[PDB]
Design a protein around this ligand. Structure first.
Ligand SMILES: CCCCCCCCCCC(=O)O[C@H](COC(=O)CCCCC)COP(=O)(O)OCCN
Ligand SMILES: CC(=O)N[C@@H]1[C@@H](O)[C@H](O)[C@@H](CO)O[C@H]1O
Ligand SMILES: *[C@@H]1O[C@H](CO)[C@@H](O)[C@H](O)[C@H]1NC(C)=O
Ligand SMILES: *[C@@H]1O[C@H](CO)[C@@H](O)[C@H](O)[C@H]1NC(C)=O
Length: 402
């Protein structure tokens, strides 16, 4: 999420905690700036490694004060940790105690590791507590910097994946543009909708990559980038679904362009955008009003209805084409049906695997590939889009589908 924090000290209970997966040899910097001191301060910090990812997931800030005691009485989850505490009589707002010239303090469940560093890439929990000895007085700035300026783990693979996807979509666009240019005398609206889909995918990937670059080099995410990416993704998915429905219905390929076919039937099927969008932005906001739990039910219902309709229509159209004795289009429709079947099977298998790999054990022992749940869908969509592109490639005899 973030790699730089600003915290005015006199707030709440003064605790500051964060849990996240971190690289190895990552340093944590604390800086204190503000008005002249009046009172003495006592700063205590804990940095704990986590063996398995459950602890980070179910870490509640409001109970941190209690959590610590469970850690101290030797009853918490397994994992080594470092603890330290220092006392300043008026203010050490200029000293560099946490910067350099430190000592080697032993770790607890010797070691003699660096004062404030990560000794192994894993899920870490950092807690800092400021006690003032007897309205703002200070403003603590906290940063984490590792081998990469601000890009923690769990984000590096995602950034690389988005870069690769951007390159792939650029290649898709270049190839489609070349084919279209070669044969411009005749074309079909489907070959324009495909290009629009490619363009939207390119824009989504570019936005995501730029946002990740900014987060890496500045430590803060851009406020209005996730929303834009989600909206673009929803638009692209809705357009692809509508295109598939139109192709299956045979509108303009096997039957005359009847008006009723679109009106009240297909275009209304664009409400799938709303729901698809509705959850999207909410997922960015964190599901604060917890409707995210009751958000995917309408989406699943709509997807089931659309699949049922698509398969019924495909069977009807293929039967009609076989009866008509046409041969050229029959092979194309057969390949289209096979591709759809394979996509459905892959989606089912992926859902089963994710469910059986995440909600199956007390706590995940393999958090490294925890990002795959947010990347398989995009790869599958890219594969489907490439197959469709190859099927409907403009050619010299691009008139068999009048
Ligand atoms: C309260 C305790 C129980 C709760 C389980 C909550 C798990 C969170 C993930 C939800 C999920 O399981 O994901 C959804 C898939 O449907 C399902 O629900 C799975 C089968 C069940 C059918 C209702 C949404 O994903 P989608 O929009 O279909 O993916 C397409 C996107 N292109
Ligand atoms: C092998 C290794 O990393 N050794 C490190 C060294 O790089 C670093 O300059 C020094 C500073 O405390 O601590 C030790
Ligand atoms: C800071 O608070 C701790 C409480 O854990 C207590 O030992 C003392 O007041 C301070 N610690 C020092 C001065 O080492
Ligand atoms: C703490 O000691 C004095 C006493 O008030 C204070 O003025 C100063 O800023 C702090 N540091 C030192 C070295 O005196």
């Amino acid at each position: 999420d973030r790699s730089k924090w600003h915290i005015p000290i006199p707030s709440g209970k003064n605790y500051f905690s964060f849990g996240k997966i971190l690289f190895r040899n990552t340093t944590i910097f604390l800086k204190f700036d503000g008005e002249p001191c009046d009172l003495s301060l006592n700063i205590t910090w804990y940095l704990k490694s986590a063996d398995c990812y459950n602890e980070i997931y179910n870490f509640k800030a409001e109970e941190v004060e209690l959590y610590l005691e469970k850690l101290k009485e030797k009853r918490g989850l397994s994992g080594k940790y470092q603890t330290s505490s220092k006392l300043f009589q008026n203010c050490s707002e200029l000293f560099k105690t946490q910067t350099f010239s430190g000592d080697f303090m032993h770790r607890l469940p010797t070691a003699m590791h660096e004062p404030l560093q990560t000794w192994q890439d894993a899920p870490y929990i950092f807690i800092v507590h400021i006690g003032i000895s007897s309205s703002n007085l200070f403003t603590m700035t906290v940063e984490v910097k590792g081998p990469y300026e601000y890009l923690t783990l769990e984000d590096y693979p995602l950034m690389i994946f988005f870069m690769v996807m951007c390159i792939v979509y650029v290649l898709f666009g270049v190839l489609w543009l070349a084919w279209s240019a070669c044969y411009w005398r005749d074309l079909l609206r489907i070959q324009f909708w495909i290009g629009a889909v490619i363009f939207l995918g390119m824009l989504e990937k570019a936005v995501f990559y730029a946002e990740f670059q900014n987060i890496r080099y500045k430590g803060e995410s851009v406020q209005g980038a996730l929303i834009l990416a989600e909206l673009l993704s929803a638009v692209k998915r809705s357009l692809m679904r509508t295109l598939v429905i139109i192709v299956s219905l045979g509108y303009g390929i096997v039957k005359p362009r009847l008006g009723v076919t679109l009106h009240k039937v297909v275009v209304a099927g664009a409400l799938y955008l709303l729901f698809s969008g509705m959850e999207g932005v909410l997922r960015v906001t964190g599901a604060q009003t917890d409707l995210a739990s009751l958000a995917f039910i309408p989406l699943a219902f709509l997807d089931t209805a659309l699949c049922w309709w698509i398969f019924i229509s495909l069977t009807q159209t293929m039967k009609l084409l076989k009866l008509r004795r046409n041969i050229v289009k029959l092979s194309l429709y057969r390949h289209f049906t096979n591709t759809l079947i394979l996509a459905v099977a892959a989606s089912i298998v992926f859902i089963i695997w994710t469910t059986m790999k995440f909600r199956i054990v007390t706590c995940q022992s393999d958090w490294r590939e925890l990002w795959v749940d947010d990347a398989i869908w995009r790869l599958l969509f890219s594969m489907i889009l490439f197959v469709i592109m190859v099927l409907w490639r403009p050619s010299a005899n691009n008139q068999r589908f009048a």
